[PDB]
RNA sequence: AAAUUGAAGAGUUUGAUCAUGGCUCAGAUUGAACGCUGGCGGCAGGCCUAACACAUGCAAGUCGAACGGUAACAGGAAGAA
């Protein structure tokens with residue numbers, strides 16, 4: 001019922017006394033389509049084995065995101081080691097406007113309308129981390145209402 | 156009542172990685188030029204260079220209801236016609 005898709009696959013190497021030892025890495029994102037999204041990173045000698053490992057890694061380490069209506073509550077800015085991510089909620093019907101890694105993360109999470117831009121490095125492993133960081137730190141008016149002790153007359 | 160409801164990335168330094176950093180590409184546009192090809196119509200546009208030199212024709216005339224006047228055409232009439 002939940003959706004899963006593969007971000008990128010990369011071949012890595014570890015040289016030994018005999019020579020190189022080739023390996024394959026898989027970055028995947030798993031989301032239920034509501035705002036519960038996670039990512040998994042796995043390593044294996046074979047591409048099917050590597051992608052499978054990332055699949056179970058993503059089912060654990062799931063997070064929850066509070067969405068308004070298929071979109072973000074407010075503009076959000078997610079920063080990881082070398083990647084800067086700016087996402088802001090857009091109007092209905094505008095669709096998803098984001099880079100490769102961010103679009104997959106966003107679409108499996110369940111955000112249909114969003115304007116998202118990536119600054120800094122565009123390494124898939126780090127932009128996915130930055131995107132997850134933004135969806136965390138974004139908040140909901142009811143949790144803010146309890147946070148400030150001011151009820152929900154703000155909106 | 157309606158009057159911007161708007162932001163995408165990729166390749167390349169390494170045995171492999173992250174970062175930094177340049178180079179390149181995917182878009183739109185043009186008073187365009189060239190190559191290959193070419194049926195029609197509508198609208199628009201068309202010396203960006205030598206403010207270089209110019210044959211030829213035209214591009215500022217009009218008024219007789221300002222004036223003298225009759226070169227020219229037509230009308231009008233004295234008269235050997």
Ligand SMILES: [Mg+2]
Pocket residue numbers: none
């Ligand atoms: Mg000129």
